[PDB]
Structures are given as C-alpha cells and as structure tokens.
Amino acid sequence: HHSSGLVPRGSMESGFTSKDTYLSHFNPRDYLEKYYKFGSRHSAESQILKHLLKNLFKIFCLDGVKGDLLIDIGSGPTIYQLLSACESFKEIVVTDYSDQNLQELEKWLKAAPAAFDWSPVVTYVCDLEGNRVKGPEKEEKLRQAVKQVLKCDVTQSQPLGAVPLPPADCVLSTLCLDAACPDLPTYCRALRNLGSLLKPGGFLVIMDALKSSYYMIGEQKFSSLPLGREAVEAAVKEAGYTIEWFEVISQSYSSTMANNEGLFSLVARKL
Ligand SMILES: NC(=O)c1cccc(C#C[C@@H](CC[C@H](N)C(=O)O)C[C@H]2O[C@@H](n3cnc4c(N)ncnc43)[C@H](O)[C@@H]2O)c1
C-alpha cells in the first residue's frame, strides 16, 4: 500500500503515520544527509540547526539547567542536541523508537569510520562555548557522557519499558513529539509518560516545529501534529508542568522538506 505523496506514509487508514513506518521507512543516513548535511551555506535547514544549538547552549550553559542524569527522547540518528548538555550533566541516556536510528547512534559512539560526520556542527558549538576546547576534545567528552542507548516509545506508560533508570534531572526532546503523537490527547499523555522519568521539579526541555502537518525525507512523507503555541502551552501545563520560558521563531524549513510555520523552544519544570 503506497499513496505516492497523496498522504504521508503509513497514514492512509488512520490519518497519521503509524509507528511501524518508522521501523521500516525511516532511513537514518538519508535523514542526516537531508537535514544535517549542508551542500550550500545559509540554507533554511542550516539556520534552524544554528538556532537550536544556540538555544541549547543558552539553556544548559548560560542558564542553570544541570544535574546528574539527562534523558534524550526521540533523538533519532542525531547527536547535536547533546553537545552543550554534556557540559552540564554527568550521564546522558539517548533514546529513540527506530532501531535503525539506534544503530546509527551506536556507530558514532564507537567512532566507526562509516559513521556520520558531525565535526562542522561540533566546531560551531565549540565557538559558542568560547573556544575552550576544539572539535575532537568536545566529541570525546560527549561520547564518554552517553552511558546508554535504549529504545523508547512515548505512547507507553513506561516509555523505556522495564529498563531501570534513576529519576532524571532533565528530559530533552527535539523534533520528536510532533511526529510521535497523532492527536493532542496522545500528546498530553506522552508528556505525562516522560514525567514518570523525572524527579519532582526536574526540567523538561522541548523543541519542535509549529503548525507542521508533515515533514519530508527525500520522497518519503511523514506525518506531524500541527500544533500551535497556544495548544502546546495548554498541553504542557495540563500534563503537570510549569513553563519557565517559551520561545517561538518564524524561521521555517523549506516546504520541500516540511510545511512548518516556525519552531518553538520551552523549558518547563515538573509540578
Ligand atoms: N514535526 C516536523 O515537522 C519535523 C521536521 C523535521 C524533522 C522532524 C523529525 C524527526 C525525528 C527525530 C529527529 C531528531 N530528534 C532531531 O533532533 O532531529 C522523529 C523521531 O521520533 C521517533 N519516534 C517516532 N515515533 C516515536 C515514539 N512513539 N516514541 C519514540 N520516538 C518516536 C522516530 O524514531 C524518529 O527518530 C520532524
């Protein structure tokens, strides 16, 4: 069953991309080449990455978002969202639903030659942090900080299954909840499930697209929940969090890659 661009893959029946689609049709190499590999500078996807890195830098380095344990939810094949965080947290746990994404992640932790090249992104973060260290030293600190790579499902009461983890100080999730939640009630339940991994008063850091109904990996279209800022704030507060700050930007992806109307960033604390 293929729709050929009429509807997102795995959504003809339910209206939203199913979880099985990510296990079979989400190619981590093609995703990294499309969104985090840049042919010409100053591209729309490069501007979004630069803004994400600057916010993560401000959150973990300039602000007081630190702790012992950081859990990354829906990381996919990416590690850019952890570069500043490894300076504030001793241990980092990386999670995603796609087994292929976990394989691409584990290839980078072992520094395999066929792994993705994150050095231009690492150098940018080093410049943001005052050039105290260089690229290779920055990457090694993150690899030593990542202590576990697990499979996760935000729709389950126990997102990590039966794996025992201590209550985390922060939960980070970038560009995942819009793709993992078919509706707002599931979005609210997903936020609650992540709360079961947090200490009372732990931080919730979320960055995602705004009013996005789909995103593209080459020719493959994947569904996205078109949430507005107003809907996001209500869902976060309803799930039992207090928002410390909430930022929205107008910069969007290219329509040939996503139909978003900007992105948002928020830091919340568990009530
Ligand atoms: N919304 C948009 O328009 C849009 C625009 C551009 C890019 C994206 C995206 C994406 C990726 C993550 C990117 C990564 N985090 C990063 O930072 O780039 C979605 C990830 O979410 C995971 N997943 C899907 N279902 C899940 C579930 N039930 N439980 C946990 N994980 C789930 C998938 O495996 C996938 O890896 C979305």
Q: Whose CA is nearest to atom 25 of ligand 1?
A: 180
Q: Give the residues across from 205 on adjacent strands.
A: 172, 267
* Positions of E strands within 52-176: 67-72, 89-96, 146-151, 168-174
User: From residue 26, how far is each of 30, 98, 148, 160, 252 by CA, in Å?
Assistant: 8, 8, 22, 20, 22
Asked whether 194 and 204 are in contact (CB, 8 A), the reply is yes
Q: Is 179 in the pocket of ligand 1 (CB under 6 A)?
A: yes
Resolution in A: 2.2
Residue 84 carries which side chain, given as an amino acid letter? S
Experimentally, the structure was elucidated by: X-ray
The strand order across the sheet containing 89-96 reads 146-151, 89-96, 67-72, 168-174, 198-209, 263-270, 241-249
Provide the 10 A C-beta neighbour count for residue 115.
Answer: 17
* Positions of E strands within 97-161: 146-151
The helix/strand count (H/E) of the chain reads as 9, 9
User: What's 124's domain CATH number?
Assistant: 3.40.50.150
Q: Is 191 in the pocket of ligand 1 (CB under 6 A)?
A: no
Tell me how many degrees the CA angle 115-119-123 measures, rounded to the nearest 5. 160
Kindly report the backbone phi and psi dihedral angles of residue 97, in degrees, each rounded to the nearest multiple of 5, phi listed first: -80, -35
User: From residue 188, how far is each of 42, 234, 235, 264 by CA, in Å?
Assistant: 35, 9, 5, 17
131: left (phi over 0), alpha (psi -120 to 50) or beta: left
Residue 150's closest CA among 71, 80, 70, 67?
A: 71
Q: Which two tokens stand for residue 247?
A: 């930022």
Asked whether 199 and 102 are in contact (CB, 8 A), the reply is no
CA 118 to chain centre: 16
Residue 190's closest CA among 97, 262, 56, 99?
A: 97
d(CA 238, CA 183): 15
Q: Best substitution site from 96, 207, 222, 255 to test ligand 1's pocket, by max atoms within 8 Å of Cβ?
A: 96
Kindly report the backbone phi and psi dihedral angles of residue 13, in degrees, each rounded to the nearest multiple of 5, phi listed first: -85, -50
3 state DSSP class of 59 = helix
d(CA 203, CA 61): 14
Q: Give the range of the structural domain holding residue 92, as residue numbers without chain letter.
A: 1-271
Residue 213 labelled as part of a binding site: no
Nearest-atom number in ligand 1 for the CA of 258 is: 3
Asked whether 205 and 92 are in contact (CB, 8 A), the reply is no
Q: Give the residues across from 217 on adjacent strands.
A: 220
Number of domains in the chain: 1
- Distance from the CA of 76 to the center of ligand 1, in angstroms? 6
